[PDB]
Amino acid sequence: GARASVLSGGELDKWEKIRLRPGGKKQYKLKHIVWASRELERFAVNPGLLETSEGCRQILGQLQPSLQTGSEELRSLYNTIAVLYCVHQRIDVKDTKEALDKIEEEQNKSKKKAQ
Amino acid sequence: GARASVLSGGELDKWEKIRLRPGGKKQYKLKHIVWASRELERFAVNPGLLETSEGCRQILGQLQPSLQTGSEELRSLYNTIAVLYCVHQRIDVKDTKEALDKIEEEQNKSKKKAQ
Amino acid sequence: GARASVLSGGELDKWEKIRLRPGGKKQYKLKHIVWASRELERFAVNPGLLETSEGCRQILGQLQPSLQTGSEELRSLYNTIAVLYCVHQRIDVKDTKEALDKIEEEQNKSKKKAQ
Amino acid sequence: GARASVLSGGELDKWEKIRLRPGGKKQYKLKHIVWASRELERFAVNPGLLETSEGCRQILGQLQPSLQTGSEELRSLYNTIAVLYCVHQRIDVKDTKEALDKIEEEQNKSKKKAQ
Amino acid sequence: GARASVLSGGELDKWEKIRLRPGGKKQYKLKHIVWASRELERFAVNPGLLETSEGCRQILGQLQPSLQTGSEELRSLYNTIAVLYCVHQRIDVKDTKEALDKIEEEQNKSKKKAQ
Amino acid sequence: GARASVLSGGELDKWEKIRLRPGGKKQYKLKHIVWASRELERFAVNPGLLETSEGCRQILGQLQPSLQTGSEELRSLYNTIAVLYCVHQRIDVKDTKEALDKIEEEQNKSKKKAQ
Numbered sequence: 001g002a003r004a005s006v007l008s009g010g011e012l013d014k015w016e017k018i019r020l021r022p023g024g025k026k027q028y029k030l031k032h033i034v035w036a037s038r039e040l041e042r043f044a045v046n047p048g049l050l051e052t053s054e055g056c057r058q059i060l061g062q063l064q065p066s067l068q069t070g071s072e073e074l075r076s077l078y079n080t081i082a083v084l085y086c087v088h089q090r091i092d093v094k095d096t097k098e099a100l101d102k103i104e105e106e107q108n109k110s111k112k113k114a115q
Numbered sequence: 116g117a118r119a120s121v122l123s124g125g126e127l128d129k130w131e132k133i134r135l136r137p138g139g140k141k142q143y144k145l146k147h148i149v150w151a152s153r154e155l156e157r158f159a160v161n162p163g164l165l166e167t168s169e170g171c172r173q174i175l176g177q178l179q180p181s182l183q184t185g186s187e188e189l190r191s192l193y194n195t196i197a198v199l200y201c202v203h204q205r206i207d208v209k210d211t212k213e214a215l216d217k218i219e220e221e222q223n224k225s226k227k228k229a230q
Numbered sequence: 231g232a233r234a235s236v237l238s239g240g241e242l243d244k245w246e247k248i249r250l251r252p253g254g255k256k257q258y259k260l261k262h263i264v265w266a267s268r269e270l271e272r273f274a275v276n277p278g279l280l281e282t283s284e285g286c287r288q289i290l291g292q293l294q295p296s297l298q299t300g301s302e303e304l305r306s307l308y309n310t311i312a313v314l315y316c317v318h319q320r321i322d323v324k325d326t327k328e329a330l331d332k333i334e335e336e337q338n339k340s341k342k343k344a345q
Numbered sequence: 346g347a348r349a350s351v352l353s354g355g356e357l358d359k360w361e362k363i364r365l366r367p368g369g370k371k372q373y374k375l376k377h378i379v380w381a382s383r384e385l386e387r388f389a390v391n392p393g394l395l396e397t398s399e400g401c402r403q404i405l406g407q408l409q410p411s412l413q414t415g416s417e418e419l420r421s422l423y424n425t426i427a428v429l430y431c432v433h434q435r436i437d438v439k440d441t442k443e444a445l446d447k448i449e450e451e452q453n454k455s456k457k458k459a460q
Numbered sequence: 461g462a463r464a465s466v467l468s469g470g471e472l473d474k475w476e477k478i479r480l481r482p483g484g485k486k487q488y489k490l491k492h493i494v495w496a497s498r499e500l501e502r503f504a505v506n507p508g509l510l511e512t513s514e515g516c517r518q519i520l521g522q523l524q525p526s527l528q529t530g531s532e533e534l535r536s537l538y539n540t541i542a543v544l545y546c547v548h549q550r551i552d553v554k555d556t557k558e559a560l561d562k563i564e565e566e567q568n569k570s571k572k573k574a575q
Numbered sequence: 576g577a578r579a580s581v582l583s584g585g586e587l588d589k590w591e592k593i594r595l596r597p598g599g600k601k602q603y604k605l606k607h608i609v610w611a612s613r614e615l616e617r618f619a620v621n622p623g624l625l626e627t628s629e630g631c632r633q634i635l636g637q638l639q640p641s642l643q644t645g646s647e648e649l650r651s652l653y654n655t656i657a658v659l660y661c662v663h664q665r666i667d668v669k670d671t672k673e674a675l676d677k678i679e680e681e682q683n684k685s686k687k688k689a690q
């Protein structure tokens with residue numbers, strides 16, 4: 001229906017604060033958390049993966065390489081899955097952009113220890 | 116009232132499975148998650164700490180040393196906070212006892228790197 | 231209600247004899263044994279600890295360091311728990327003051343064998 | 346009449362648990378605590394000695410050597426005084442037999458330091 | 461009821477001036493001095509300790525280490541007890557934040573002469 | 576009118592206890608705290624100085640040297656300002672005389688480090 005699950009009380013507060021973009025006027029809302037869950041199940045991917053910091057990582061991994069080959073439907077996903085994942089880990093970005101940079105750098109560190 | 120928050124969908128499934136004791140017949144229920152939250156706020160500790168793997172650790176830290184000096188009210192807490200914490204981390208114990216051993220050993224490892 | 235439990239027949243006799251203070255005119259009474267039990271349960275500490283020489287020691291241990299930081303509510307406790315403990319051990323002080331000195335010295339002896 | 350005195354709240358719980366024998370179906374009850382007190386006063390020995398871990402030791406000392414020369418009336422005493430004494434000291438035997446072994450061994454240790 | 465006691469005439473003037481926060485619009489009022497006194501007595505700590513520069517120090521000492529383990533109820537306390545203490549000592553901060561820094565540095569100085 | 580200000584709740588208790596003289600039967604009362612405040616303002620000195628341990632010192636400093644050249648009106652002042660000051664500092668004298676000795680000795684110590 002429209003209840004909490006993916007994000008807890010504390011996460012919800014920050015979530016509503018985070019904005020979809022750095023230079024916008026539309027904060028994040030449950031509409032985005034559910035909008036992704038629906039598109040997820042469509043790709044044979046349960047929405048529960050978003051409720052777990054581990055499940056999200058698995059999703060971003062498939063969408064990562066499918067960022068250029070993927071379509072708009074995939075783009076939006078990476079946006080939500082990003083801001084959400086950051087919440088489950090620790091990163092408390094203000095927008096969806098900052099979340100992309102953080103996750104982008106974290107991957108660059110592993111490159112040195114996984115080349 | 117009586118909804119989800121501390122434990123997500125996936126965590127809820129396992130939670131209901133976990134038993135309060137190894138040799139008992141009373142599985143875990145929301146009644147225990149809320150019963151603790153109430154006692155928490157009483158000690159100037161918000162119940163939200165339980166909804167976060169980080170908050171729980173902070174609680175178990177105070178109850179740890181207060182296991183002998185503390186009263187029954189504290190004992191029950193360590194029981195719930197344990198099974199719950201294990202869920203947020205990764206440990207999927209079957210009872211409350213196993214959760215105590217796991218958390219007990221994890222602390223023994225740090226002793227070698229923090230003596 | 232108002233029966234015996236913490237102190238036996240023999241202990242009761244001495245208890246009623248012991249005075250709350252060295253220079254006073256108000257001997258000890260069950261009112262003080264129960265008055266403490268109530269404040270104990272409030273701190274998550276069962277009143278039964280007073281019925282056992284072992285339980286008392288555990289209480290005085292927490293109130294010991296909380297003698298300066300603690301409030302008046304704690305002071306009164308240390309007073310009763312003292313006269314009572316002395317009864318369960320062996321010390322048969324006449325007032326609450328003497329009980330403080332006895333327990334104070336006993337701790338000084340361990341300091342030499344636990345520094 | 347039929348109230349508490351010799352055994353406190355905590356001791357009462359364990360007392361009712363302890364059985365008169367290892368292979369029996371008759372747990373301990375106040376009937377046994379009073380039954381002994383009556384026989385005690387008969388031997389010029391106050392029943393209060395049972396309410397004190399010190400008094401009990403004095404009793405078991407006289408009945409110890411009078412275990413063979415004594416009659417059945419003495420046997421029953423050593424049985425109750427045993428389970429009771431163990432409670433006041435620390436030993437939490439399950440039956441009256443275990444209590445005899447514990448007290449029997451404790452005496453063997455002194456033999457090495459008192460021969 | 462609602463009279464003066466903790467803060468004198470001169471202290472009252474400055475108190476009303478001091479703000480709860482550096483970037484806010486809600487100055488300090490008796491409501492905060494009493495709000496703390498109530499929470500104090502709850503922790504077995506008399507409210508009079510706030511009326512004395514010595515009593516405050518004793519309070520901040522317990523709340524100091526309980527800043528992370530403590531709950532929101534404790535946070536607010538450290539806020540009021542801070543601005544108040546500064547008044548009794550000499551520090552005339554403008555907000556509650558400045559008071560935290562002053563007391564924080566003062567403790568750093570002792571570290572060099574108490575390590 | 577006739578309320579508290581210079582002395583807090585705790586100070587008031589001790590104040591009422593302190594006596595104007597060592598061998599008298601007239602304890603201290605608000606009448607003396609106000610009686611001085613009135614004479615203070617007369618000398619271009621605000622009564623608030625008495626509500627502050629710092630203000631008092633400034634007063635005793637002027638009356639100190641004016642103890643012989645001053646009149647009876649000044650004598651009474653030094654008496655009240657003394658017992659009061661001792662309260663704000665720490666000294667808990669029983670009479671006004673003891674307060675004079677304490678403050679007299681404290682000044683003798685500085686003489687060695689300020690000759």
Ligand SMILES: *C(=O)CCCCCCCCCCCCC
Pocket residue numbers: 001002003
């Ligand atoms: C929002 O309310 C979340 C619930 C998701 C819809 C559940 C639909 C009801 C479940 C039982 C229907 C299955 C029919 C056999």
Ligand SMILES: *C(=O)CCCCCCCCCCCCC
Pocket residue numbers: 116117118
């Ligand atoms: C269970 O339903 C969880 C909700 C917790 C109780 C909230 C009570 C309602 C909130 C507003 C009342 C405050 C009055 C100004």
Ligand SMILES: *C(=O)CCCCCCCCCCCCC
Pocket residue numbers: 231232233
């Ligand atoms: C004094 O008489 C000591 C007894 C303590 C009060 C016990 C109250 C009665 C116990 C049963 C009531 C519980 C209701 C289900």
Ligand SMILES: *C(=O)CCCCCCCCCCCCC
Pocket residue numbers: 346347348
């Ligand atoms: C059980 O109720 C324990 C009480 C023991 C019996 C006491 C009998 C009453 C005491 C006063 C009677 C003495 C006659 C002068």
Ligand SMILES: *C(=O)CCCCCCCCCCCCC
Pocket residue numbers: 461462463
């Ligand atoms: C505000 O007016 C501060 C006063 C605090 C309340 C005091 C209540 C009255 C004191 C006597 C009542 C005790 C009943 C025996």
Ligand SMILES: *C(=O)CCCCCCCCCCCCC
Pocket residue numbers: 576577578
């Ligand atoms: C005792 O009640 C202390 C109060 C001191 C007297 C104050 C007098 C009232 C203040 C306003 C009057 C000024 C006239 C413009």
